[PDB]
Amino acid sequence: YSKIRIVGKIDVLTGLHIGGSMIGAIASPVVRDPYSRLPIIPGSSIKGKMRSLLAKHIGQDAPEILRLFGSSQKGAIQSSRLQISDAFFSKASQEEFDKKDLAYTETKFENTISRLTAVANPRQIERVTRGASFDFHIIYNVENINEVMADFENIKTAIHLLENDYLGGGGTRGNGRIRFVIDSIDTVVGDFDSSNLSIK
């Protein structure tokens, strides 16, 4: 039984909103660390988006996605192979934003025009400012050696889809475009070889 640590940085190409009040105030705050107040990307959002994109690509019922993201169906209890930690705002990006006195999270003012009265309703959303970076840690559990390559190809397809997709918030409207840069792939636990394995 081996474990493969994936170390990576997620780059905010367009303002990221993962959601998670007073009048006249942003009513859609992003998820933030309760202590450090640095906005984060919940690992649940990454895992769910990857699972959804894998479902769309393969098609959930499919045995491959179910093993990768966990199964609780009767007679088919499977442990999730992808344990993805919540993304943490990176130190380098934190320094680059400390310079030039730039806030970590931009606010975006949006309006909806009604189809009947043509009136406009205004919403202020919080988005992680474009150019930010979130360290991402993923643990892949090698339950079976024979399926490692196939699972990693599935991960690669999911990552590529997410590069062309968004992450959280309203992505059909521009929010959530992200790019994954993987710092390293390495076998933290066990003797398995992950040198040839590339997430992207």
Binding site: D33, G43, S44, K47, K74, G75, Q83, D86, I139, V189
Partner: protein
């Protein structure tokens, strides 16, 4: 061989106690022992050695300044401050046993605790949306530790047992502990080192004895130990977490154990209990006793 194990948590942890919404700052020894058993099963390591030769302590808070033990259950001759005082620095705890701690210093110790902050993440399930349904919200409890703070526990065992614990904890670093692990929580880093201070608290002789872990004695030991004791009887219930156990997830048999920090004038040895019912493998619950001797 008492070994102090310190866990510093990178991401928030759930550590559920009764629901998914609520979060506990620590876990009892039974949860950590179950995690160790699961890890040994995954690593193809024998369970008998860990079950027999290992006695572990509940997880307890610590800061850069002090390591906090549970408040002993002893008679107090104000009371709201002592109720609020859940954890005491180990140097303060001997004074608390001596009874020198007043109400104001009790409140000061209680406020001194800077373990971390408990939050509640609001998430959704979108599975139904694809199958012509609506999304459903839910909530996951979280506890994020301050950068200096962390959790710790003391483990006593043979040298081979200690090495096996080291390997299992090295794996548990990435496996994680608590609820909603493998979904963004419970990730931690562990460091195991001998601790002279804890050994000094370990070696002690007193009229009274206090549990460091959630435990319960067998009936024969219960007859002698129960008398002249002040204890908190906590219920340990849960769903089995395994693929081998059954086709569908099955609840464990309800257990009741003396909470850590309970005071017994007569000590009892612990017992590993089986809360399995009609399952393929027996589900183990840790009820062994870790003892500290004190004078009141």
């Amino acid at each position: 061989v008492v070994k102090l194990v310190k866990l510093t948590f990178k991401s928030p942890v759930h550590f559920g106690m009764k629901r998914l919404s609520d979060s506990n700052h620590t876990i009892a020894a039974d949860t950590l022992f179950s995690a160790l058993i699961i890890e040994a099963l995954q690593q193809q390591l024998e369970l008998s050695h860990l079950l027999n030769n290992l006695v572990i302590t509940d997880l307890f808070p610590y800061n850069k300044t002090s390591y906090f033990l549970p408040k002993p259950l002893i008679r107090i001759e104000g009371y709201k401050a002592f109720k609020k005082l859940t954890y005491i620095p180990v140097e303060n705890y001997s004074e608390y046993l001596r009874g020198e701690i007043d109400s104001l210093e009790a409140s000061k110790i209680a406020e001194s605790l800077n373990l971390g902050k408990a939050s509640l993440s609001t998430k959704v399930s979108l599975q139904a949306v694809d199958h012509n349904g609506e999304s459903e919200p839910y909530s996951v409890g979280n506890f994020t530790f301050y950068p200096e703070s962390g959790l710790y526990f003391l483990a006593k065992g043979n040298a081979d047992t200690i090495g096996q614990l080291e390997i299992l904890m090295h794996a548990l670093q990435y496996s994680g502990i608590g609820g909603k692990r493998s979904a963004g929580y419970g990730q931690f880093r562990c460091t195991i080192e001998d601790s002279g201070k804890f050994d000094s608290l370990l070696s002690q002789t007193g009229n009274i004895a206090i549990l460091l872990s959630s435990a319960m004695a067998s009936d024969e030991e219960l007859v002698d130990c129960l008398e002249d004791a002040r204890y908190l009887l906590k219920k340990r219930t849960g769903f089995v977490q395994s693929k081998t156990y059954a086709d569908q997830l099955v609840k464990k048999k309800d257990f009741y154990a003396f909470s850590a920090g309970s005071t017994f004038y007569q000590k009892f040895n612990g017992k590993i209990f089986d809360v399995s019912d009609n399952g393929r493998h027996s589900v183990y619950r840790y009820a062994k006793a870790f003892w500290l001797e004190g004078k009141i």
